[PDB]
Enzyme design. Structure first.
Site, PDB file in Angstrom:
ATOM      1  N   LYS A   1     -18.512 188.584 154.534  1.00 37.46           N
ATOM      2  CA  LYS A   1     -17.767 187.725 153.626  1.00 37.46           C
ATOM      3  C   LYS A   1     -16.328 187.803 154.145  1.00 37.46           C
ATOM      4  O   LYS A   1     -15.787 188.897 154.324  1.00 37.46           O
ATOM      5  CB  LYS A   1     -17.869 188.219 152.185  1.00 37.46           C
ATOM      6  CG  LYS A   1     -17.336 187.199 151.193  1.00 37.46           C
ATOM      7  CD  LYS A   1     -17.423 187.684 149.757  1.00 37.46           C
ATOM      8  CE  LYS A   1     -17.073 186.546 148.812  1.00 37.46           C
ATOM      9  NZ  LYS A   1     -18.085 185.480 148.902  1.00 37.46           N
TER      10      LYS A   1
ATOM     11  N   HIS B   1     -16.669 190.249 142.044  1.00 38.14           N
ATOM     12  CA  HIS B   1     -15.251 190.436 141.734  1.00 38.14           C
ATOM     13  C   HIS B   1     -14.846 191.487 140.714  1.00 38.14           C
ATOM     14  O   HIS B   1     -13.661 191.751 140.565  1.00 38.14           O
ATOM     15  CB  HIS B   1     -14.681 189.080 141.304  1.00 38.14           C
ATOM     16  CG  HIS B   1     -14.879 188.004 142.322  1.00 38.14           C
ATOM     17  ND1 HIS B   1     -14.230 188.006 143.540  1.00 38.14           N
ATOM     18  CD2 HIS B   1     -15.664 186.903 142.313  1.00 38.14           C
ATOM     19  CE1 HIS B   1     -14.609 186.948 144.238  1.00 38.14           C
ATOM     20  NE2 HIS B   1     -15.479 186.261 143.515  1.00 38.14           N
TER      21      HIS B   1
ATOM     22  N   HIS C   1     -16.129 182.197 138.649  1.00 42.39           N
ATOM     23  CA  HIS C   1     -15.509 181.997 139.961  1.00 42.39           C
ATOM     24  C   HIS C   1     -14.089 182.535 140.013  1.00 42.39           C
ATOM     25  O   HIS C   1     -13.303 182.319 139.078  1.00 42.39           O
ATOM     26  CB  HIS C   1     -15.486 180.499 140.283  1.00 42.39           C
ATOM     27  CG  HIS C   1     -14.580 180.123 141.414  1.00 42.39           C
ATOM     28  ND1 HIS C   1     -14.827 180.481 142.723  1.00 42.39           N
ATOM     29  CD2 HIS C   1     -13.434 179.400 141.438  1.00 42.39           C
ATOM     30  CE1 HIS C   1     -13.878 179.993 143.501  1.00 42.39           C
ATOM     31  NE2 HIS C   1     -13.020 179.330 142.745  1.00 42.39           N
ATOM     32  N   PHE C   2     -13.770 183.247 141.098  1.00 37.65           N
ATOM     33  CA  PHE C   2     -12.418 183.762 141.305  1.00 37.65           C
ATOM     34  C   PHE C   2     -11.740 182.694 142.165  1.00 37.65           C
ATOM     35  O   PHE C   2     -12.094 182.513 143.348  1.00 37.65           O
ATOM     36  CB  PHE C   2     -12.427 185.088 142.075  1.00 37.65           C
ATOM     37  CG  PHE C   2     -11.089 185.773 142.100  1.00 37.65           C
ATOM     38  CD1 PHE C   2     -10.715 186.641 141.071  1.00 37.65           C
ATOM     39  CD2 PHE C   2     -10.166 185.489 143.104  1.00 37.65           C
ATOM     40  CE1 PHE C   2      -9.447 187.207 141.039  1.00 37.65           C
ATOM     41  CE2 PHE C   2      -8.876 186.058 143.083  1.00 37.65           C
ATOM     42  CZ  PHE C   2      -8.518 186.908 142.057  1.00 37.65           C
ATOM     43  N   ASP C   3     -10.759 181.999 141.602  1.00 38.97           N
ATOM     44  CA  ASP C   3     -10.104 180.928 142.362  1.00 38.97           C
ATOM     45  C   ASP C   3      -8.887 181.348 143.187  1.00 38.97           C
ATOM     46  O   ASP C   3      -8.675 180.831 144.285  1.00 38.97           O
ATOM     47  CB  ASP C   3      -9.732 179.774 141.416  1.00 38.97           C
ATOM     48  CG  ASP C   3      -9.617 178.431 142.137  1.00 38.97           C
ATOM     49  OD1 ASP C   3     -10.584 178.038 142.830  1.00 38.97           O
ATOM     50  OD2 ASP C   3      -8.573 177.753 142.002  1.00 38.97           O
TER      51      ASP C   3
END
Lengths: 126, 460, 460, 126
Positions: free
Chosen positions: D40, D11, D118-120
């Site tokens: 992805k 990210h 983590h990219f939420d």
């Protein structure tokens, strides 16, 4: 590849013992490039000196299977080994049955010097 | 990033210089195959060391090398590096004996990533095999594919192998061809498969002394593994009765067998009627070999009727050396011109003569035909039927491979084939002409055609 | 003896020593792929000489590099050697322009062994394409497959390309997706296609400005090329009217198309119903991608009814982003439990919700299921599904791949799936979990699972 | 590979132009190792120095997509580029939809140091 070396490759194995084993054909057919792209269905190796196979070109004249007037049958039954494709073989998993025996050979000869250019058949006349 | 390298040498003498030159590749390649490279027990030490430092190796194939029991031992030690992830491994024809099975047995307990093993062409015997089975039973063994063809195994090996099948829900393929395990052993191996939860994908027990009554054991197998894709049972005097008792399994709605190998199994015309019932019913059966069975012209008639009826979706029919004559060829011509599912027809070693071949050419020459591969080796073909073959290659455009090896073909016949394939309109991609006698002129004429059209390979 | 070798370096930074240490491989490798490895124009000469002595080069793939026209010409000279057996070439996205096409065209005149050529992602423009087609027309050009995606071509470059199809009797693939050939362009190509004796297999025209009318030009292709296996038309405004006009082609006797790729084609349930007529009639269709089309639940129903009747042998359905809801899941569920042909369903990004996912599981979990792959990504999946997704992974024994990417799953629900797949008996081969968050603890559990069961890959 | 480093590779692309062209995602996704295997589906790259993204773990706390509580929403909007698989894509050929925009970002945080793992999601509230 000339019309003479390919004969040595596909049909010559002078110094190999006569009594071939169950690995010979599977081994030799692989090493002599007869299972590339497609499994060569049947092939015969000769256990004799090149000079011996070369003289057949001047030994008894005979007719080739196809019908051309210019084949030759050897004077003596040479020590050969027949390799037969199994009816369960599926390229590239070529599988052969090795059959060593003593038979006269029938080859085709052409050119100058006069030399074998095709292995035609083996004969059991003894 | 991604760096993938592969090396696959076959039948090559390797110099010492060239060897050290390849060692860096052994340390780097995910795929390595040194088939018949003269490898020595000694040299199995360079491989051992190189593989010990290859955190990539996923496939190792050392087929046909005199590694001996000591050599294999050195090679197996190389797989002990913590980060190894070998998934495939072949030691076919490596002079491995029962005296090496202990080491391999204790090696299999430590390679959880290992999924495929080929031990064929080695003299293991029952004691060695039984000893290995102990290693395979370890929960750390995640083997799914194992080939033990020609391993000097007899009926005394099946109980041990049956236990392994019971312990491997993930099992996919077992091959035991060329081992006289007899009627009981076969009955014992199949017992395992039945119990075992493993969805078997391919079972091969050719030349295993499989008997007619066993055709009942195998019945329970075909009617029990929806996952079964390949079943090879060649070279066993199964019989027409044997065929009969197999159908109930094949004809089962859940059966989805794609490939059935029954060459030389004691089957005749009557057993055909039996197999035709399966063909017409199971659209899942795509490949079928009946090579070396005495089907006779009456067997081909039966097979041809079903191939001309809606239902059967067979794709490859292998019927070489089945004892057919020209009388049964008008039918195959129709199938080659009216069938939209068959792409390959191995019909070698059949005395079809020029009359029969010409009929075949008539059907394939019909517009609409779809056949892709045709094998007509040793079918008593000469120059007569050669003009046809030459024109068929210009009219039909679906054929991609034609095998006319080991026939009577003449220089006038080949010339005709040449005059057709040399053209840009003929889309044939492979012509095979083993054991055939043409003139020194034809040779060069053939060698010219090569360069004039490299997309067409002429194998001889 | 053979010595097959290959090297594939994707996205990597290579030092001078690593490069220097690669060259020998470029002299021996049958397959060479150097994709996004910062290749320099000067490094081209090094590539050329190396390839010059390679005695078996078949595949040359240099995907993404700034080779430039100059760089391109360099490598090309390496191939222009008396002895070259090149078969496929990849110079996709390598900075070649119209200017550098003049040389490329002439180089193409001397490589009769070359069968494939990837020139996509290069600003060739119309002038270059035509400058390239001069060579393609040379009878010594035996190219069978050509990809020109994103080549900056308009309708103009369409007549010159039309000149090649007419010239090539055995042309296999023409990929011209992602250029603006538009209505006028698409028509020109189709005429040339039918104006050619080629037994074409695949044709791509996605994102080409293909219109509804253009669909009457394509209908002539499907009917005329009986050898057609792939027809890609995604991202074109075909609509229901277009989809309808295609049918007469898809229903032509000689058409046995295998894969119809028509995503985002402006089709609705109306055109879907038309396509289902072709599906039920052609057991030959194997892959259908109707992704991104607003099919709605009715379309989901028309498909399922079709997947529950004879003929139709489609094996993989791609219906992601189709506007389906749980009100159609009982249907698909019934297909999973009753259909014996469908092996891969892509239904990601459809409001199936937990209720919908439970139904599907009920169908898949039924005895006798055959599905092998399932995609349920971004379809509103949460923990109230995992207990059920677990019940499936054990009661089902065919699924080999399950994708649950981008769903609001909790480590709780994920634990349920774990309890199933951890079992040696769980036949699953690959779990996809992209964009799913979970603690370090579950991370630990998954990193360990990934180690303790290497046959199962848990992609993330 | 630590969870923090994964977040970077997947990210973070701090050192890149905000107005990335449609060529960007096809480029980035492959180079950052998100295609080898299975394409992805949806990813997001942030055009901000690493310290700004790390600073989010100290801003507004919000509920994570999966119910967890350690997610944070940036107080400001940031330069990002979203990459989404185009339906013509078929592994290994993974092409993308590139949407470079400005939005608030939400990330999950954990550890010592306390950083993004983590990219939420991304939010549009202005």
């Amino acid at each position: 590849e000339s019309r003479a070396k390919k004969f040595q490759r596909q049909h010559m194995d002078s110094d190999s013992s006569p009594s071939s084993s169950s690995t010979y054909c599977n081994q030799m057919m692989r090493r002599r490039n007869m299972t590339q792209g497609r499994c060569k269905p049947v092939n015969t190796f000769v256990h004799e000196p090149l000079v011996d196979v070369q003289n057949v070109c001047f030994q008894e004249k005979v007719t080739c299977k196809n019908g051309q007037g210019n084949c030759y049958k050897s004077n003596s039954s040479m020590h050969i080994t027949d390799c037969r494709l199994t009816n369960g073989s599926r390229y590239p998993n070529c599988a052969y049955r090795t059959s060593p025996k003593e038979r006269h050979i029938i080859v085709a000869c052409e050119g100058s010097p006069y030399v074998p250019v095709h292995f035609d058949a083996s004969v059991e006349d003894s | 990033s991604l760096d993938i390298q592969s090396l696959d040498i076959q039948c090559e003498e390797l110099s010492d210089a060239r060897w050290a030159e390849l060692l860096p590749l052994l340390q780097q390649c995910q795929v390595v195959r040194l088939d018949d490279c003269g490898l020595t027990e000694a040299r199995c030490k360079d491989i051992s060391s190189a593989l010990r430092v290859n955190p990539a190796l996923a496939e190792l194939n050392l087929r046909s090398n005199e590694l001996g029991d000591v050599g294999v031992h050195c090679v197996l030690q190389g797989l002990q590096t913590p980060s190894c992830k070998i998934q495939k491994l072949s030691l076919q024809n490596c002079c491995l004996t029962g005296a090496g099975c202990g080491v391999l047995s204790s090696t299999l307990r430590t390679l959880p990533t290992l999924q495929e093993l080929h031990l064929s062409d080695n003299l293991l015997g029952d004691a060695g095999l039984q000893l290995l089975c102990e290693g395979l039973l370890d929960p750390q063994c995640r083997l799914e594919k194992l080939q033990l063809e020609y391993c000097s195994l007899s009926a005394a090996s099946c109980e041990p192998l049956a236990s392994v099948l019971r312990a491997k829900p993930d099992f996919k393929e077992l091959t035991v061809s060329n081992n006289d395990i007899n009627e009981a052993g076969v009955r014992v191996l199949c017992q395992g498969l039945k119990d075992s939860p493993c969805q078997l994908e391919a079972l091969k027990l050719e030349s295993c002394g499989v008997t007619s009554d066993n055709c009942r054991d195998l019945c329970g197998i075909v009617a029990s593994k929806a996952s079964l894709r390949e079943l090879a049972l060649g070279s066993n005097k199964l019989g027409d009765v044997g065929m009969a008792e197999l159908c109930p399994g094949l004809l089962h709605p859940s059966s989805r067998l794609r490939t059935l190998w029954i060459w030389e199994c004691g089957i005749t015309a009557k057993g055909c009627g039996d197999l035709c019932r399966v063909l017409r019913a199971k659209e899942s059966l795509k490949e079928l070999s009946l090579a070396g069975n005495e089907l006779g012209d009456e067997g081909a008639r039966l097979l041809c009727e079903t191939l001309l009826e809606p239902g059967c979706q067979l794709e490859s029919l292998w019927v070489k050396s089945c004892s057919f004559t020209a009388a049964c060829c008008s039918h195959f011509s129709s199938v080659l011109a009216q069938n939209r599912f068959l792409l390959e027809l191995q019909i070698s070693n059949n005395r079809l003569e020029d009359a029969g071949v010409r009929e075949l050419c008539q059907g394939l020459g019909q517009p609409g035909s779809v056949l892709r591969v045709l094998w007509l080796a040793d079918c008593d073909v000469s120059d007569s039927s050669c003009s046809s073959l030459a024109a068929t290659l210009l009219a039909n455009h679906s054929l991609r491979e034609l095998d006319l090896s080991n026939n009577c073909l003449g220089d006038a016949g080949i010339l005709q084939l040449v005059e057709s394939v040399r053209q840009p309109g003929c889309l044939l991609e492979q012509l095979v002409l083993y054991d055939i006698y043409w003139s020194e002129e034809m040779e060069d004429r053939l060698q010219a055609l090569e360069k004039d059209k490299p997309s067409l390979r002429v194998i001889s």
